[PDB]
C-alpha cells in the first residue's frame, strides 16, 4: 500500500532535512523505543531499591501514591534514528493518563535512560492494564498505519 511523498519546493537536496520529516511521519510508538518493562516493589517514593536509579529520584524532589513500581528502560540508538527527547517521551505518557499516575525520568545524559512511575484494592492487576495501554495505544511522533518509511 505504499505512497511516495516529495518535499516542499526549495527543501530538496537538504539531506538532513530528510530524516527531519521521516520522523515526522513514520508512526513511532513507545513500544518501538522501549527495551523492557519491569514491575518493582519500591514503597519508599524517596529512594529506589535500585542502585543505578538513585541520582534520578534525588533530582525530582529538590525541585498519597502507590508502592508498586513500573520501570521502563529505553533505547538510545532508537532515540536518534527518529529524533526524540526523554522530556517529550514521558511528557506524552503524562498527558496520556494525566492527573492520576505519577511519572519521572532520567536525563538525556545518563548512560541509562529510564521512566519510573506508580499508580494512585488490587494494584498489580491494574498496573498491567496500564502496562499495555502504555505500549500499543501510545503514540510519540508520526502518523498511524504508516510503519517504516525511507529516503
Amino acid at each position: 500500500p505504499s505512497l511516495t511523498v516529495y518535499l516542499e519546493p526549495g527543501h530538496a537536496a537538504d539531506q538532513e532535512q530528510a530524516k527531519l520529516i521521516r520522523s515526522a511521519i513514520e508512526h513511532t510508538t513507545l513500544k518501538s523505543v522501549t527495551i523492557a518493562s519491569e514491575i518493582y516493589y519500591d514503597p519508599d517514593p524517596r529512594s529506589t531499591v535500585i542502585p543505578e536509579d538513585e541520582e534520578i529520584i534525588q533530582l525530582h524532589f529538590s525541585l498519597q501514591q502507590s508502592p508498586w513500581l513500573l520501570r521502563l528502560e529505553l533505547d538510545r540508538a532508537a532515540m536518534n534514528d527518529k529524533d526524540l527527547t526523554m522530556g517529550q517521551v514521558g511528557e506524552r505518557i503524562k498527558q496520556t493518563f494525566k492527573n492520576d499516575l505519577f511519572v519521572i525520568w532520567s536525563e538525556d545524559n545518563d548512560e541509562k535512560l529510564i521512566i519510573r512511575c506508580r499508580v494512585v484494592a488490587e494494584e498489580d492487576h491494574m498496573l498491567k492494564k496500564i502496562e499495555n495501554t502504555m505500549l500499543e495505544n501510545i503514540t510519540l511522533r508520526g502518523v498511524e498505519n504508516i510503519e517504516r518509511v525511507v529516503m
Partner: protein, 119 residues
C-alpha cells in the same frame, strides 16, 4: 527472573505485600506456605534482544560427517582439527561468522573481529 515454587505442595508462587513491615513475599494459592522475597525484581519484558549464539555441541560433533573441516589453530590446544558452522539462531538478520571446534579439547572459538565472546 528465576522464579520459584514452594515445597510440599509444589506449584506456582504469587507475590503479596507485607504492609506492616513493608516487604516482599511470594506464596501458594493452593496451600498456605509463604516465603520472603529473593529480590525486588518482579518482572521483565525484554523487547529488543541481542542474540549471537553457538550450538550445544553434544561432543560427538566430530563424528557427524555433514560438517566441513578447517586447518586453523585453537587459542589453547593448538590442534588442527576443526569443524565449523553458524549461529543456530534461525533469524534473518543474523550475521555470518564461524564457530569452529577443537576435536582435542572442545573449545568454541570464533573468527570474529569486532566483538569478543566467551559463551
Amino acid at each position: 527472573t528465576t522464579f520459584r515454587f514452594c515445597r510440599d505442595c509444589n506449584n506456582m508462587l504469587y507475590p503479596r505485600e507485607d504492609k506492616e513491615n513493608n516487604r516482599l513475599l511470594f506464596e501458594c494459592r493452593t496451600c498456605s506456605y509463604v516465603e520472603e522475597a529473593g529480590s525486588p525484581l518482579v518482572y521483565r519484558h525484554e523487547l529488543i534482544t541481542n542474540i549471537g549464539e553457538t550450538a550445544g555441541v553434544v561432543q560427538d560433533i566430530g563424528s557427524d560427517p555433514t560438517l566441513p573441516r578447517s586447518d586453523r589453530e585453537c587459542p589453547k590446544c593448538h590442534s588442527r582439527e576443526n569443524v565449523f558452522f553458524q549461529s543456530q539462531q534461525r533469524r534473518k538478520d543474523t550475521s555470518m561468522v564461524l564457530f569452529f571446534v577443537c576435536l582435542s579439547c572442545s573449545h568454541i572459538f570464533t573468527s570474529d573481529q569486532k566483538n569478543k565472546r566467551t559463551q
